[model samples]
Target: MLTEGISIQSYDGHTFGALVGSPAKAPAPVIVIAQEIFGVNAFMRETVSWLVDQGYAAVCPDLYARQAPGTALDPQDERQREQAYKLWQAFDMEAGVGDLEAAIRYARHQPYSNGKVGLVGYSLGGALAFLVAAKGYVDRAVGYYGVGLEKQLNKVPEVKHPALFHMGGQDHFVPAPSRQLITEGFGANPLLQVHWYEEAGHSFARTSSSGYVASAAALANERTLDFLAPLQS
Candidate 1:
C-alpha cells in the first residue's frame, strides 16, 4: 500500500494538491473523491485509505486549493465551521469542476491506475461529481446528500453512465419539495438511481461530523461499493 500527496494542475493553470492512496497491487482502478466544503480533511483521507484497502487507487482532491490551499478544517470547531461556510459561498463551481476533472485525468495516467475512474462525493463534492459525470469524466459516480442538486437538473439528460444519488429524507438543506424535484427531474434517466434514507440528515456518512448516522451511512457505503463494482475490471 502507498499513501502520498500529489499536485495536479487545473484547467486554468492553477496548481492544487490531492491526497492519494494505492493498494498493494499496481494498475488498479481509481476512484476520485470530491471533498466537502471543509476541504480534504481527516474523513476524506480515511475514505482514501478505505478505498485503497478495498484494492483500488483513490484520490481526494482539494477543491479549495485556489482560495485556501492545504485546507483541512475541523468539522467540530465553530470558527472553522463559519470559515467553511464563507469558503462555500465564495467557491466557484465551474473552477472546482475543472480541478476535479484534472484529478480524473491525473488518476488515469498514474502508474498504479488501470485507466478506469470512478467518483464519490459528499455534499458540495457530490454536486461536483454529478457535473463531472454529466461531462463524462468518469466511469461511474455516487453522491451522498448533495445540496442544490435539483438546481442542476438540466444536466441530468447529459449523464451517460451509471450514477447513484443518496438523499436524506430529513435533510433541512434539501427540503421535501427539492427532493421531490430531484426525483422528478431524474425519473426518466434510467441510468441514474436515487436512494433515500428516511431517517438521515445531511452528511450522514461523515464520521467526524455531528450529522453522522451509522445505519444510513453503512447502507449508503454498501450501495456505493456495489454501484462501483463494475469499475473493477
Candidate 2:
C-alpha cells in the first residue's frame, strides 16, 4: 500500500489534512476512515492501512483540522483527555460533512480509485459518517458507537445510502435507551443495518482506548469490510 499526506480545499477555501492509501493496481475502491474524538490519531491511521491491505484505496480526512490542529493526547493525563473531548465537541458537524463530501470527491478522482466510495467512522466521526451517507455522498457507510444520536435522530431520514452501524450494548456514554432509539428508528430504514455487540462498550473498536474489546472489534471490522466489499465491486 502507498500512503501519502495531502490537503483538500474545503468550500470555505481552507485546506484540510488528509491521508490517502492506495493499492498497487489502478481503479481500486475507496474507503473514507473518519477519526474519533482524539483527531486523526494512530487508530484511524491503522484503519486506513487495514483497508489498503484489503485492496481498497483509503483516505482519512482531518475533520478537526479547523478547530484543533496538531492536537496530541497523553493517555496518562485525565485533564488532557477532557480537554481533547471539549475540542471534539466544538467541531462543527455541518462543516465536517462538507469536508467529508470534498474528501469523497478527491478520492473518486484518484488514479487508483474505481470511483466507488464508502465511509467508516468512530465516535463523533461515526455520527458524521452517518450524516454524510444520509446525504447520499457515498455508496455505503459504517458507524461505530456514535454518541448524540438522540439529539440528531431526525437527521436519520436523510440517509439514502446503505449503512451498517455497530453499537456497544454495555456503553455508558451511549446508554441502552439511546442505542435503542437509534436502532429502532434508523433500523426501520430498509437501507440501514444495526448490530449491537453484547460485550462491547464505548470505544471498543479502538485499540488505543482501555475500553477496547479485541474480539468485538475484530468481528466488527470483519463485518464492516464485508459490507464495503460488495458496494465497491
Candidate 3:
C-alpha cells in the first residue's frame, strides 16, 4: 500500500489536505473518501488502504483541515468521541462541498487517474457525499448511514449518478422517522438504491468498535463495491 499527503489550496487561500492512496496500478478509477465527524482518522486511513488494495486511487480530503487540521480520533475512547462532536459543531458544511470538490478534481488530475470518480463516505461524510452527487460531482457514490438525508430530500431528484445508501434500522441516531424520510424521498428514484440492516446500528462497518456489526457491515460493504464496480475506469 502506498500513501501520501497532498496539500490542496482553495481560491480564497484556505488550506485543505488530502490523503492520497495508490494501488499497484496507475490510471485506475479514483475514489473520494469523506470523513466521519472524527475527521480523517486511523479508521478512514484504513479505508484508503483497502480501496487501494482493491485497485483504485483513494483521496480523502480534510473537510475540517482549514478550521481544525489533522484531527484523528479513537471512537472507542469516550473523551475522544465527545471531542469529535465538538469539532463537528464548529464545522462549516457548505464550505465542505468546495473542499470535497477540490479533492475530486485533484483525483481526476492525478497522473494515476483513469478519469472515473467514485465516493464512499461514513456518517457526516456520507451525507456530504450524497449532496456532492446531487451536485453532479462524480460517476458513482455510496453513503454509509449518512446523517442528513431528510434535509436534502428535495435535491435528491437532481442527482444524475448512481447513488447507494446504507441505513441501520437499529441506529438510534437515525431512527424510524428519519429512515421514513429517505424512503419517502428517494424510493422512487431509479438511480438510487437503499439497503436496510435490521440488526445493525451506527458505524456498523467500523471494525472492533462498540458499534461494529460484522455481518451487516460486510454485506453493506460488498454491496457498495458491487455498485461501484461498473464505473471502474
Candidate 4:
C-alpha cells in the first residue's frame, strides 16, 4: 500500500534514490525495475505499482543517482529528451549493473521479501537485464525491446536462469538481422523464450510514451506476467 521514494545503498556503498511499489501483503517476491534513459519518472513509478498489483514488490533503482540524483525527465519534451541523452552518453554500464545487483541483494535481505528477486527492464535497462541474467544473479530476467542485445550474443549463452525476450518487429532499434542473430545464437537455450510484435515499435508497452500500441502492450504484458508467475515462487 505504500509507494514512495526510498534510498538504495548500492554495492559500492553509494546511496541513491529509488521508488517503491509495495503490495498490501508482506513478504512478497520483489521485482527490480531498470529504467530507461528518461529516468525513474512517472512511467517507472506507474510500472512499479502495476507490478505490485501482480503481488510483488517493485523496486526501481535510480541508475543515474551518481550523476544526477532522482532524474525525472519527460520523454515527450524535446529539450528534456536532449538532457536525458546527455545522461545516457555519460552513463556507465557497470555502475548501472552494480546498482541493480545491489537492489536485488537488498530485496532478498528485506523482511518483506519472500527471498525471490526478478529483473524487469525496458530500453537501456532491458539490455542491462540481459547482462544481469547472464551473470546469474536473479531468479528471472525479462527484457522488452532491449537495445544492443544482439551485440551481446556471445555472452547470453552464459545466462543460467530463465529469461523472456519481447521484441517489436517495427522497432528499428532491434532490427530483423539482430533478432535473427538473437534467435540463432541464444534462442535454442531451454531457459529462454522469445516473442515478437510485428506491428509495434519501440516502447510499445510504455502507454505514456509515443510508440505505445495497446494491442501489443496488452499481449506482451500478459505474456510477461505469465512468464513470471510460476517463476516467482
Whole-model lDDT per candidate: 0.88, 0.82, 0.84, 0.85
TM-score of each predicted structure versus truth: 0.96, 0.92, 0.95, 0.94
Give Cα distance to truth, residue 164, candidate 4, Å.
0.7
Tens digits of per-residue lDDT, candidate 3, 99-164, equal 888778788878888898899999999888888888888999899988868788998789898899
Which candidate gets the maximum TM-score versus the true structure?
1
lDDT of 1 by residue, 1-233 (tens): 11344779988899888888875698789999998889888889889988988878898888898897888888899999999999999999999889988999999988888899999999998888888879988999888888889899999899999899998898999888898889999997988999999989999998877888999999999999888878886
RMSD of each: 1.8, 2.2, 1.8, 1.9
- Model 3 clashing-pair count: 1
Residue-level lDDT of model 2, residues 1-233, one tens digit each, is: 11345878888987777777776566788988887877666776688878888889888887777986555455437997897789876888899899999998888888887889888999887888778877999999899988776677787678787988888889888776787787778866888888889999989987768889999999999999899988555
Error of 2 at 207 (Å): 1.9
Model 4 Cα RMSD, 1 decimal:
1.9
Q: List the candidate 1 regions with Cα displacement exceeding 4 Å.
A: 1-5
Off by over 4 Å in 2: 1-5, 72-79
Candidate 3 stretches greater than 4 Å from native: 1-5
Which should have the higher TM-score, number 1 or number 3? 1
